[PDB]
Amino acid sequence: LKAQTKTEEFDAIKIALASPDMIRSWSFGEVKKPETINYRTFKPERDGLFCARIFGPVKDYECLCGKYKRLKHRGVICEKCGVEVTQTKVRRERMGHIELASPTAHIWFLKSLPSRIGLLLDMPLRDIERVLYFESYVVIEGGMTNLERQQILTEEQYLDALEEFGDEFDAKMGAEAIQALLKSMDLEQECEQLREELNETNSETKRKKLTKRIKLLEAFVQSGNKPEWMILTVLPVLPPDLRPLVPLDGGRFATSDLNDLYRRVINRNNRLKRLLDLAAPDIIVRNEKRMLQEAVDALLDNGRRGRAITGSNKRPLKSLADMIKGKQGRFRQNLLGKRVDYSGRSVITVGPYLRLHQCGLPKKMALELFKPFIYGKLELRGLATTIKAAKKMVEREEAVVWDILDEVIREHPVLLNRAPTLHRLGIQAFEPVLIEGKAIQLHPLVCAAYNADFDGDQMAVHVPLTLEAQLEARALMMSTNNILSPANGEPIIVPSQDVVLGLYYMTRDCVNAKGEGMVLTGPKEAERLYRSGLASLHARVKVRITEYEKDANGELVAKTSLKDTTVGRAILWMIVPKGLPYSIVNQALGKKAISKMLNTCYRILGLKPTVIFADQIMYTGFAYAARSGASVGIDDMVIPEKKHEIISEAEAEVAEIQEQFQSGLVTAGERYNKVIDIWAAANDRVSKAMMDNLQTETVINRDGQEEKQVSFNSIYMMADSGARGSAAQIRQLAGMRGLMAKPDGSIIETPITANFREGLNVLQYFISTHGARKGLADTALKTANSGYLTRRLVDVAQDLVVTEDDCGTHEGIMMTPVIEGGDVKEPLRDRVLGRVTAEDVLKPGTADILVPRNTLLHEQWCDLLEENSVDAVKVRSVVSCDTDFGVCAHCYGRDLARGHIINKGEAIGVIAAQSIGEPGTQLTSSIQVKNKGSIKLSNVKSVVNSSGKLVITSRNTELKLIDEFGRTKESYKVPYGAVLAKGDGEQVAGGETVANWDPHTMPVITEVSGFVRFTDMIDGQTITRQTDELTGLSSLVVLDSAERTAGGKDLRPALKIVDAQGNDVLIPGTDMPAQYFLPGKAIVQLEDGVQISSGDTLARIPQTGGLPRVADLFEARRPKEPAILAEISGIVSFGKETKGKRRLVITPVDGSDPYEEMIPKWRQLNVFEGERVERGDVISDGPEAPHDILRLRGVHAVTRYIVNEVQDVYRLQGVKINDKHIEVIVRQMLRKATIVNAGSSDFLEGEQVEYSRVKIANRELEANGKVGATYSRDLLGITKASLATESFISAASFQETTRVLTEAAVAGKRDELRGLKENVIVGRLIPAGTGYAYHQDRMRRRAAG
Amino acid sequence: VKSDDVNGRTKMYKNIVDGNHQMEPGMPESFNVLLKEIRSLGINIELED
Amino acid sequence: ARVTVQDAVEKIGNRFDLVLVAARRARQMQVGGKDPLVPEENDKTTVIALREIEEGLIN
């Protein structure tokens, strides 16, 4: 196609450097007289900052003398005053000028940290500044003179430099001379000399400068600018449309700061030219140049001197850059940017009758906000005359506008937006209705999403001024149109109130029910059986139901089914859309149960049927909730007949422990903990009481004897479906509260044995008062710092918007149900749901794909993930996305307000920061198999010993569980050395040990058999003789490698095994001797003479889950102790003892061989110097560090561990996140790819991973050989990656404006103003949604023709 | 237009009271500050085709 | 009144250019253009455009 050659939309901005000529293009006058006033007549001085010819018409087409008035003379120029009468708006574009007489130098590129001019001349700050301070005669092009091309001169020396050389020698001082120096700098000559140093000096002190200086140079080549133009010579004057002048009643003038500034600059400007008319030496003309130097500066931002003030008034003047900079980065547009129009604040309430798609606004408040539309509508239908007449209509409460009011509100897709939302789905849409009230009546089934109730939630109502907002409102913002969450399949609409508890009264089942026995054929008459209230809603009746299940291609195959359910579910069924199978609704009914009710209903049928569904249930639900008034206050609480007795038991029992203290059987401290245990023991027995009691004690007779029915007690109904409030604290209301925190920090040694049904004691509750303190405070401050955490989160991920369709990577990450301990914790489904398959996943069968690589992953496909034996499902994410500067639709998936194709221009990084900071506010013996099947061993170096057992000579012994189907069930992380009793592939009963480890003994067990002969182990220098007085079997305890002899320290206590004859035996597997060295303080098990077998002990070796921990994570903070892993594989031994840090020599057979690490020897050396450790084996033990895992182990491993670790935090939080988000944060932290291999950019130039991707892409082809540059993924923190921003304007909004401004300006990185925050500050279309529509058309439009 | 241009809302309010469901940006005065400011240094704004 | 406009979302999948279409259409029903065919009932022209998309006659 072809685009338009006419103006349709704005474009990209190029920011680099411009020439002084370019500047003068807008100068339309030369300001002469500096004085802005006429002093006498309160009027604007002509030929000044308020001149008609230099700037513009005083008023619109109006002359100051008031000579010209009519429009036809819109261009006439007075023979005297050439002033074209024009629109005063044009007096914002009308720039003026100050022809400089002083060569000015960029204070900015000379002073600001980025001393670009300094390292460009291979010279220091002081001296270059000494020339630009008018103190040194810089030498300009000498050659073979006394000085260099770049060196200063003092008065005395300059005169002698002339005596020695008057020929071929000229040197001036100030910017004048610097102008000359730059006029002679042939850049490419300089470039090739830097290439000389490129191959000569590889020293950082001059090579980093190399890459900075040349980068500077090539960026200028890339733009075509010259160092000559870096000499300010032109001084434009910003138009009067930026600095007013108005007389007051009294004779004063309200001039602006800038006016008295240009006055200053122009006054001295003529004074300098006066020093020309009168001819003054350079010492003096440049003295005025010093004065005019600062003049230019003081106007801009004064650069960095002292913020020029005004006469008699102590106040730093508001300069140009100060009209830019201000509050929160960019002053105006950003912080406090003009009071919002069309929008207001209000409280929410009940209002039951309001349908799900419509909210209820109060009459009069609605009026005040929708007034505008009323006016337009009035003169459109034919009722109003003018806007003034229409205002008077509302002014009189005209019955006319009331009907019109109905027309513009009853169908207005409005945005109910809550400003403080740290989540996308907190901003939704509804439909206002003429409601008589004083609050926003809201539909209850939406509050779950808002996590609110009806008692004080403040919300604001935003009015869609254009159809744009209106159309998104009811389409993608409407409640009924986005019942999904960007975390998984979370249905926005769900009963979590007493409305759902009301449904438990519906699907309640007790034997006491009139009608229990008859049969039913119609669900409709069932409801009419209760509308009259005859047959109990708890009556068990045989119901003939029709059940639909759409297993076909566009056809729901139905079937005949006779069931038996209460009248409750009977009534329920009447409004169920076909798409929902009867199975789901036939249950116990609970909060999350009824939640997944509608979820399957939607993921199988569709949206609309869900809408109608939700509403109707709401009404019926409330009905039954009323009938179930849950009472409280003294009267409904109960006390267990067992509570008081078990307390009494544990009462005289602790009195017994008091006596066993007076006797001497237990220590005082062990007395406390023991008592703690038994009171907690009594505490759990108190549970064993109040639960059975309060779950079935209610019995009633009907159709037989007294059958046991679930307790009708409201506490029970709360502990079944649930609304708000934990039944555990309720448990500590009817039962003993237990223990609390003491005023010191530990736990109370004197438990509260009383209950809150009665009034518990002052003193113990006074200690409970300390508990109160605790709670309150915590919540209070953490919320604040948490929002700030998400602040830095968005600060680093806003650049991530979906901009491409397809990338090109066949890579992704391994999403697996990370089963730890027993049954699966973090499932397969809720990590894969909503994403895109990385590659063809397999079934328990091969050559039969269950999810082709290219698939839209949703319910159906996830149902497949659940019915097969599949354990490994690789799903692709943004971290591996090949897309440059963003992600492609095919890499993200379908996750959105909708369940279909992700929009191209749908920002994802931003909605993820929000979607991780959301839970951020929520942050402050043996392996006996439990199943029945085949015990499976996974990667283990097992060995068999005498009598028939199976010990382990490896650390990571992952015992997987394979059931009678193949699906992996359990998975235990077995330590080192475990006495395996059952074999690999035997059926084992549920409750029998198969893997019996021992955490107290970690011995070295030999795979070699024979007689033990301790070689290189001397009795006294390396091993001590401290035989155990009980065991007759002598042992030789190996002392630590720091308490041995001198020559004993560098000795490796070797355990050598010989066979039944007398020969040194190798290790079955390696070609190394049977040298099994013992680490420090490791007591040997045997002595010389002991016949040992394969797998026998011969040397026994001995041994926060919070937000600040997540803080550690996102800040790359080096924790308390980094886990020491082997940075290389192979055989291992010690090296160089006590002198400093230990040198652990780990030598492979064909890798980096002389590699030995710097590991402190006083740390725990769990390195198995007998076994061949892996390049990632435990050398120590405990939590590792982000950094570490990433670099030596692998990319895929670290980020999969990070998601496993941060989610772990969320395991204590019980949260399930669609992992793509946690990784968007991670991808931004790895935006920096340190280009390691020498190539094009540099040898240490860190750049965009995207940039470097395409870099190697085109350099490994032609015009080269093997000169490409390999890059490395570096892991950083959010606070560092957010500071690593190429976009200066974005930084100039919240971070460090000025520095980043110059950081880009110095080279000329012309950023076309692309992005979110960029188009935010300017106020234009971001490349998202419809904005990107323009941008793709602008993509083909930019840099082309 | 809703929260930036002082001219943007005026130029649009006097039309919504007449009725027209669609708006147009215009020129943010904030930019007009930054824009001219960099002009004093020597930078060029460019909008072609 | 409308409770679900998912139908409009499917007739024209852009959900953005869709708004630009009705944009110029609302303009026709206001500044000259042409009269609204479907006899309106209280519903502003923005919603009238919504309905024309569901029928899929003007896009």
DSSP run (H or E) holding A594: helix A591-604
What was the elucidation method?
cryo-EM
Q: Tell whether residue A805 is among the known ligand binding residues.
A: no
Nearest chain B Cα to C24, which residue? B22
Q: Measured between alpha carbons, how far is residue A253 from residues A36, A365, A1119 in Å?
A: 10, 44, 63
Nearest chain C Cα to B18, which residue? C30
Measured between CA atoms, how close is B25 to chain A, in angstroms? 8
CB contact set of A503 (below 8 Å; sequence gap of 6+)? A495, A572, A589, A594, A617, A620, A621, A624, A721
* Distance from chain centroid for Cα A642: 51
Helix axis angle for A1220-1228 and A762-797, nearest 10°, is 60
Q: Which tokens hold the place of A851? A: 């999810």
Measured between CA atoms, how close is C29 to chain A, in angstroms? 11
SS3 content of chain A, % helix, strand, coil (to 5): 35, 15, 50
CA dist A238 and A253 (Å) reads 20
- Answer whether A1326's CB lies under 8 Å from A1316's CB: yes
DSSP string computed for A1143-1156: EEEEE-SSSS-S-E
Look at B30 and A390 and tell me if their CB atoms are within 8 Å.
no
Q: What is the 3-state secondary structure (H, E, C) of A1019-1052?
A: ECCCEECCCCCCCCCCCCEECCCCCCCHHHHCCC
Length of chain C counted residue by residue: 59
DSSP run (H or E) holding A1157: strand A1156-1159
Residue A386 Rama label (left phi>0; alpha psi -120 to 50; beta): beta
- Which residues on chain C are in Cβ contact (under 8 Å) with A1333? 16-17
* CB neighbour class for A624 (10 Å; exposed up to 12, middle 13-18, buried from 19): buried
Q: Which long-range contacts (CB under 8 A, 24 or more apart) does C31-39 make?
A: C31/B20
* CB neighbour class for A671 (10 Å; exposed up to 12, middle 13-18, buried from 19): middle
CA dist A532 and A524 (Å) reads 13
Select from C2, C17, C4 the least CA-distant residue to A482: C4
Select from A511, A444, A1222, A1095 the least CA-distant residue to A835: A1222
Residue to substitute from A223, A383, A466, interface B, most B β-carbons within 10 A: A466
A8 touches chain C (CB under 8 A): no
Select from A537, A741, A733 the least CA-distant residue to A628: A537
Measured between CA atoms, how close is B31 to chain C, in angstroms? 27
Q: Which tokens hold the place of A829? A: 């489904």
- Which residues on chain B are in Cβ contact (under 8 Å) with A466? 21-23
DSSP string computed for A1089-1137: T-EE-TT-EEEEE----SHHHHHHHHHT---SS---B-SS-BEEE--S-
CB contact set of A926 (below 8 Å; sequence gap of 6+)? A993, A995, A996, A997
- Answer whether A440's CB lies under 8 Å from A459's CB: yes
DSSP run (H or E) holding A974: strand A968-974
- Answer whether A568's CB lies under 8 Å from A538's CB: yes
CB contact set of A528 (below 8 Å; sequence gap of 6+)? none
Q: What is the 3-state secondary structure (H, E, C) of A20-38?
A: HHHHHCCEEEECCCCCCEC
CB contact set of A1187 (below 8 Å; sequence gap of 6+)? A1116, A1275
CA dist B13 and B29 (Å) reads 18
Select from A1237, A1236, A1231 the least CA-distant residue to A1249: A1231
Q: Tell whether residue A60 is among the known ligand binding residues.
A: no
Nearest chain B Cα to A467, which residue? B21
Select from A183, A26, A153, A188 the least CA-distant residue to A93: A26
Q: Measured between alpha carbons, how far is residue A969 from residues A17, A827, A981 in Å?
A: 65, 11, 20
CB contact set of A65 (below 8 Å; sequence gap of 6+)? none
CA dist A11 and A26 (Å) reads 21
Q: Which tokens hold the place of A1179? A: 């050398």
Q: Tell whether residue A63 is among the known ligand binding residues.
A: yes
Residue at A1176: amino acid letter = G
Select from A681, A969, A965 the least CA-distant residue to A820: A969
Q: Which tokens hold the place of B13? A: 């309010």
DSSP run (H or E) holding A1082: strand A1082-1084
Helix axis angle for A591-604 and A498-506, nearest 10°, is 90
DSSP run (H or E) holding A348: strand A343-349
Nearest chain A Cα to C7, which residue? A475
Measured between CA atoms, how close is B27 to chain A, in angstroms? 9
Select from A239, A171, A185 the least CA-distant residue to A213: A185
- Which residues on chain A are in Cβ contact (under 8 Å) with C23? 467-468
Residue at A362: amino acid letter = P
Dihedral sign of CA atoms A378, A384, A387, A389 in order: negative
Residue A1088 Rama label (left phi>0; alpha psi -120 to 50; beta): beta
Residue at A542: amino acid letter = K
10 Å Cβ neighbour count for A1072?
Answer: 10
Select from A1221, A1244, A525 the least CA-distant residue to A887: A1221
Q: Which tokens hold the place of A259? A: 């006016």
CA dist A319 and A303 (Å) reads 10
A17 touches chain B (CB under 8 A): yes
CA dist A826 and A819 (Å) reads 7
Look at B23 and A10 and tell me if their CB atoms are within 8 Å.
no
CA dist A936 and A959 (Å) reads 6
CA dist A159 and A156 (Å) reads 6
CA dist A60 and A67 (Å) reads 13
CA dist A1193 and A1201 (Å) reads 11
- Answer whether A377's CB lies under 8 Å from C44's CB: yes
B3 touches chain A (CB under 8 A): yes
CB contact set of C10 (below 8 Å; sequence gap of 6+)? none
CA dist C41 and C48 (Å) reads 9
Question: For C15, which of A373, A377, A475 is closest by C-beta distance?
Answer: A475
Residue at A998: amino acid letter = D
Look at B39 and A379 and tell me if their CB atoms are within 8 Å.
no
DSSP string computed for A430-495: E---EE-SSSEE--GGGHHHHT--SS--EEEEE---SHHHHHHIIIIIBGGG---BTTBS--S---
- Answer whether A366's CB lies under 8 Å from A409's CB: yes
* CB neighbour class for A46 (10 Å; exposed up to 12, middle 13-18, buried from 19): middle
CA dist A86 and A75 (Å) reads 8
Look at C9 and A475 and tell me if their CB atoms are within 8 Å.
yes
Residue at A719: amino acid letter = A
DSSP A936: E
Look at B22 and C44 and tell me if their CB atoms are within 8 Å.
no
Q: What is the largest CA-CA distance in chain C?
A: 31
Q: What is the 3-state secondary structure (H, E, C) of A661-700?
A: CCCCCCCHHHHHHHHHHHHHHHHHHHHHHHHHHHHHCCEE
**Separate counts of helices (H) and strands (E) for chain B:** 2, 0
* CB neighbour class for C40 (10 Å; exposed up to 12, middle 13-18, buried from 19): middle
Residue to substitute from A55, A338, A1301, interface B, most B β-carbons within 10 A: A338
At CA A854, angle to CA A849 and CA A855, rounded to 5? 80
10 Å Cβ neighbour count for A59?
Answer: 12
SS3 A576: coil
CA dist A1011 and A1018 (Å) reads 18
**Where in A553-633 does DSSP place strands (E)?**
555-566
SS3 A1013: strand
Q: Tell whether residue A457 is among the known ligand binding residues.
A: yes
Nearest chain B Cα to A1323, which residue? B28
CB contact set of A1342 (below 8 Å; sequence gap of 6+)? A11, A12, A1312
CA dist A258 and A242 (Å) reads 9
CB contact set of A308 (below 8 Å; sequence gap of 6+)? A261, A294, A298, A302, A316, A317, A319
Q: Which residue has the tokens 């169908």?
A: A411
Select from A1199, A1208, A1123, A1204 the least CA-distant residue to A1167: A1123
Q: Which residue has the tokens 């944009």?
A: C23
CA dist B8 and B16 (Å) reads 12
R_g (Cα) of chain A, nearest Å: 41
Look at A480 and C3 and tell me if their CB atoms are within 8 Å.
yes
CA dist A898 and A858 (Å) reads 12
CB contact set of A1164 (below 8 Å; sequence gap of 6+)? A1103, A1180, A1181
R_g (Cα) of chain B, nearest Å: 15
Which residues are paired to A814 by β-bridges?
A874
Measured between CA atoms, how close is A1337 to chain C, in angstroms? 13
CA dist A506 and A628 (Å) reads 10
Dihedral sign of CA atoms A1231, A1232, A1236, A1238 in order: positive
Select from A497, A331, A360 the least CA-distant residue to A430: A360
Measured between CA atoms, how close is A18 to chain B, in angstroms? 5
Helix axis angle for A909-917 and A1220-1228, nearest 10°, is 110
Q: What is the 3-state secondary structure (H, E, C) of A826-840?
A: ECCHHHHCCCEECCC
CA dist A46 and A33 (Å) reads 8
- Answer whether A1137's CB lies under 8 Å from A1172's CB: no
CB contact set of A1067 (below 8 Å; sequence gap of 6+)? A1007, A1008, A1073, A1074
Q: b/e string for A749-784 if b means 16 or more Cβ within 10 A?
A: eebbbbbbeeebeeebbebbeebeeeeeeeeeebee
Q: Which of residues 13-32 of B touch A (CB under 8 A)?
A: 13-14, 16-23, 25, 28, 30-32
- Answer whether A650's CB lies under 8 Å from A678's CB: yes
Which residues are paired to A841 by β-bridges?
A851
* CB neighbour class for A63 (10 Å; exposed up to 12, middle 13-18, buried from 19): middle
CA dist A1092 and A1011 (Å) reads 6
Q: How far separated are the first and last CA of chain C, in Å rounded?
A: 22
CA dist A505 and A629 (Å) reads 11
Phi, psi of C23 (to 5 degrees): -60, -60
CA dist A1220 and A875 (Å) reads 10
Residue at A1215: amino acid letter = V
Q: Tell whether residue A891 is among the known ligand binding residues.
A: yes
Nearest chain B Cα to A1338, which residue? B49
CA dist A741 and A769 (Å) reads 10
